[PDB]
Amino acid sequence: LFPPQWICCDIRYLDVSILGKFAVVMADPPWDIHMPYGTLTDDEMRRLNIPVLQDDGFLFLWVTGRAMELGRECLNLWGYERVDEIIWVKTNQLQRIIHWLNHGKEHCLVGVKGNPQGFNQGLDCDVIVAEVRSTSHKPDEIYGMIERLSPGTRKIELFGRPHNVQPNWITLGNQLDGIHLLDPDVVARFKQRYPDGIISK
Amino acid sequence: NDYCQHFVDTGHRPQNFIRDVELIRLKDELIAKSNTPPMYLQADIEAFDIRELTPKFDVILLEPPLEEYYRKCWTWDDIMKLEIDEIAAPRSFIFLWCGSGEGLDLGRVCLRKWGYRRCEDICWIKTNKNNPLDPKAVFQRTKEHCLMGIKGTVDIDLIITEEPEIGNIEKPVEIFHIIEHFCLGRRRLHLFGRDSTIRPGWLTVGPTLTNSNYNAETYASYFSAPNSYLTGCTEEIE
């Protein structure tokens, strides 16, 4: 079911097996990098049940600070090989760039799992140039690149926010408005696993 | 305006459309005055005991010739066995050109092998205004990463220039500006430099160098008291 779907929840405690398999996964985790919002510990990140979401596909993993290293560890533990890295050059509305150096970019790791086939590798290039909006906000350009890469396929986003909801995407995040599910297979497995519609423990 | 879509449309990489790519000049003068004379040694680094390079360096710029730069090469197998820790000052810095593939991961293994932690990830973003394929690649690779490691106790992390001509393997000279504006000390080693990278304030050691002038004793003479702890951004001592 192509129109946006989403589940407000704690990605720590949701049983993500009911959601099926995905050709693309994106995550923008609240890495614990010191100093806001609720973060997750390195072990919580390590324990996230990413491995079930895919069999053959791609992982897109926003990293910053020490998460440049930690994300490479989570990405490897979860069973992916890092095969690319996208950087988003943050600009203003007139196309100028916004510890030891000032940061003009955000990094998103690209990982692969299994042998994914039919993907349009090489349509886009590993640099995004896009205007910065709210804090902690993804540039919409990344969804276009992921669409060209894998058109039509089912995609899931972890730690999204309301603006992030997109066609072909199931958005998980604890700041979304309730539950909105249209894929019948998912609706089914959700009614089975969560007969009273609450997600705990 | 979507510049990724524009790139799929026209071949102009999104970085082509970044525009604009005081006293931060007199600091360049201070660097200039405190710079040691250029020094340089031809050496086959595979076959060369790195310990004979003394004293211990405050900065190391490591630019191994990757096979990916061509489309003698060094694999990450070879890079990881260099005993960089044996020539690095207890407090010191490293800048490792990692390319754009596995080196982004293997260069991190290296930095940790030698005792550094990475505090900056400097990206060289190659525009293609003048000219609008790894199997594992998912996207077209249009950048290279220089990783910055520290051990012990003004600028952006971006260098935007036009992609060099095929077979030109030279890294942007701007990396030296970024390094030197940090004022990290005056013992600066550039490993796998070339004749064309030789620069004042730097010891260059490479296999393609065609002349040498290195003398360990003469090199150490530049940093004997009262000059041993200068940042390279201060005035000379009278």
Ligand SMILES: CNc1cc(N2CCC[C@](O)(CNC(=O)c3ccc(CN4CCC(C)(C)CC4)cc3O)C2)ncn1
């Ligand atoms: C408790 N467990 C949870 C949490 C959870 N969240 C969902 C919504 C948001 C949430 O509420 C708080 N986190 C952030 O706002 C947040 C901030 C910054 C960043 C870093 N990123 C910023 C965007 C970037 C520039 C593309 C790249 C860097 C990521 C974030 O995620 C955590 N959903 C389910 N379970």
